[PDB]
Symmetry: C3
Subunit: 338 residues, 3 copies
Amino acid sequence: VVFCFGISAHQIAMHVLDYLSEPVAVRIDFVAQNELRIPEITVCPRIFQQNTIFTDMVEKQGIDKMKFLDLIDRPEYDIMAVWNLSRIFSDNVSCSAHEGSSIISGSYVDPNMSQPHLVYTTSGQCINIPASRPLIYRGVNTFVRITDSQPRNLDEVRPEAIQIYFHEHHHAHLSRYLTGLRGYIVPIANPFAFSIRFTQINYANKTDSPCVDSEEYAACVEDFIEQRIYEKAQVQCRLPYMRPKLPLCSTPTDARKIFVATDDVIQNFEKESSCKRKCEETLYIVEFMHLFERSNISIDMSVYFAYNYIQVATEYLTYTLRGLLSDIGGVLGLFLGI
Amino acid sequence: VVFCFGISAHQIAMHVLDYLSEPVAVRIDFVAQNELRIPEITVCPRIFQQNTIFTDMVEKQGIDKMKFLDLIDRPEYDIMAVWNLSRIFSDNVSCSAHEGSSIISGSYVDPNMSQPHLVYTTSGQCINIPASRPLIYRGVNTFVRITDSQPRNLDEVRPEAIQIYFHEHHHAHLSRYLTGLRGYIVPIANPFAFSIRFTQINYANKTDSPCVDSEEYAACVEDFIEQRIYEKAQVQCRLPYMRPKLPLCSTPTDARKIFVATDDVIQNFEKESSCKRKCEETLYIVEFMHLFERSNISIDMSVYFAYNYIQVATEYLTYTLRGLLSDIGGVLGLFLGI
Amino acid sequence: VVFCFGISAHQIAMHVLDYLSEPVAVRIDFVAQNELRIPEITVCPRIFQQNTIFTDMVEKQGIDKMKFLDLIDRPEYDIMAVWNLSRIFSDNVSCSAHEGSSIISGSYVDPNMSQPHLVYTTSGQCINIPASRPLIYRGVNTFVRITDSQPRNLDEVRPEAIQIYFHEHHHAHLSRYLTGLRGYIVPIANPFAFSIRFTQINYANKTDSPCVDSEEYAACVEDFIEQRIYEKAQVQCRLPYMRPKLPLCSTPTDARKIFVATDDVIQNFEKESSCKRKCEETLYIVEFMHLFERSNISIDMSVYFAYNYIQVATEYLTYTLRGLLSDIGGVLGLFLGI
């Protein structure tokens, strides 16, 4: 019976091996609720070279692909004096929440929401839009509108193909160092509107412990990207956020050249940095819905939620998995009977 | 061994608790079949206030947002004389079934299908299109075309942004009191065509007994919405369908004002009314496919089925769940050995 | 206890019955990887009758819907002399792989890829594009561009609505006898771009043994379609590929008329031919993404991959299914205790 004992030991070993993690997408189900978890929208030009504004500014002022401090035009260009040159859309941010429709009144609106959160990014400056309040799905017309009624419409060198990144709530790193890579470019010559199908994949938490890694992940990855930028690029002269920590260094091409080089190197970091995962990651399937609205606004990005049926793929954990692999002891006993 | 007996009793209690329902999406699989379950299409203007036709009629005839019977223009406006004022698209309904293509003959058509089913709705009048026959998927060009070759093209105050609601088969309530809320607005200035990805979520039937609640649900919710409209709005003077039951009441602003108010109140009814669920609910993922067809038709809504791979998410029931939770008695016995 | 023994025998019988196949979509999970499995693109006009080029050629040269050899215009029209008349887009095929973007350099390109693979098809001639190398997902701008910078732009009778079939790798039959049926028609008057969401459904392998039926399936179905074309159409006079096997027969209307008739008959073959399934079938959800690019190219089909999150629905096999149905012997023993 030693043979059967060994085979049963192997069966229990497979049991224990499966015990770790074993996340199965138990419920990819289409749940419809009035409550809506709006994506965190970053409205930013994709990159300095791609963006027409930065390229034109550097070409008429400086030389080459930015960098070099633009010393020839002026020796007073600080690091922020060029990084904030990324100003594209801000100071008039509206997260207008068109909640739904109704026969008696209809045209439900909520102008006061989420303010212009100005966040610096590899593009230089973006308008992150926090989810101040979940929205109400009273109809297919559940579209959160991001509007920047800019002065004069900003028709002089208007950004033609600004980028729109729908990232999860409270993620500085995604909005600051991944908006030109993991974001959807959007023309704004017309009032473009995109449906955002929701895939709330709540992964499990085991052997990859997120421990509700929904807010920690953000700061961890942000500081880690900045730390790699500091480390691989051997330049500590750049201003370390607060001025009274190390001397200012903006004129030397260090700040632009080497920092951009390192940030590009650390663009692929999910492999470089690990142990962190948004256990409540929500994916925004961006689709093109035709919009019928003569929106004269400079940018009126209508993030539509025409699908209350969130395809929530909750990556449940099968606790019964361990129970069943232990029940395998029953078949153990049935061999023992043999 | 009383401790082990109690723990095993708890295990069996969890077994019984999981026994109820426990619906897991066993098969979200992409099945391709020639047979196609066409959506029930309602082509209706979203709401009286939103629709240009009703607003213009009331503005030039009556006052305010409809209501008040439009007495000033004429005292003979019955309840139906204004509700049927919703006539937008009807009397020339075609459910043309472009089944597919073929090299020898190609251009497969089926003009005779589903007729103009005129159904009254909160919008006032809509054309529900029953699924008379399942369609054949002989190619990606499997588009059911809803065509209303209206007299004179209806170019006078033509409805610019009519609403299209794809609801499940044989649902009066969805087509009569949820077309302006749970429907997709569609411009008709151009021959718009939408892909309808199919998600046939056949939920289970336990503790929420639908008992093939595919046709009952319809009448139940319809009569319940009408019943709430009658109850909360304390007005029995309105005509109760058949004339010879209670006296006609249309001139008093009751019919419009209070009935619209109550219908708006009961707009969110899935929470108010329960115990009913379409066990065979099919979700229509509406997506924008570019159409290349100079369709001069007033409305030529092409509900495309370019994806034979229906994403059927059959919410199977794990009968083996009970069997396994009973097998837990095997691990019970293995503790008993300890 | 004979009753319990019989019930347990029935339980084991259900066990064995479930043993066969029982494929559950264990993981429909959204995996993001730099590596991209590009679809095999066939850029072909849908059908001879539908295509404007073939219809115009036959109308001005011959009579009727092709067929009849076009003898009146010229008696030298061989079978290939008309089949290759399907030349629409070829000799300048580029599978340009726009891998991604980057802040330091950006605009990553790879012009050398996959060449003009000229494959004959029911349409007559198509450009199959093999996946020479998996692509890198360094940003949402991961679009494989199929470009045919044709001489003179091919503006004379330019194919307005060419068909684009995204079929799995190394499938001759799909690209040769199912491009006008299982393919998406695409206008080329503008630089159309389609998102290709990936659904890599790796079915199981049991009782439908594919045995990694990823390359065999191709040749099997191709030769079987050709074999049915030969069999049902009683005409062996047509050239059997290699000339020195049977005499050439192209002038008689046999080649066109009867062969097209039979090929149409065998259009629905998945029911006719069985035992073959792509165990690694990948489905391309074709969606419309608006493109901002003034591509003067005649055809610049941008198969975008803006969704690194491949919805891989791996149809795993539950080996633990057999183990649990055997554990049912534990509940067998618990009845025996009763």
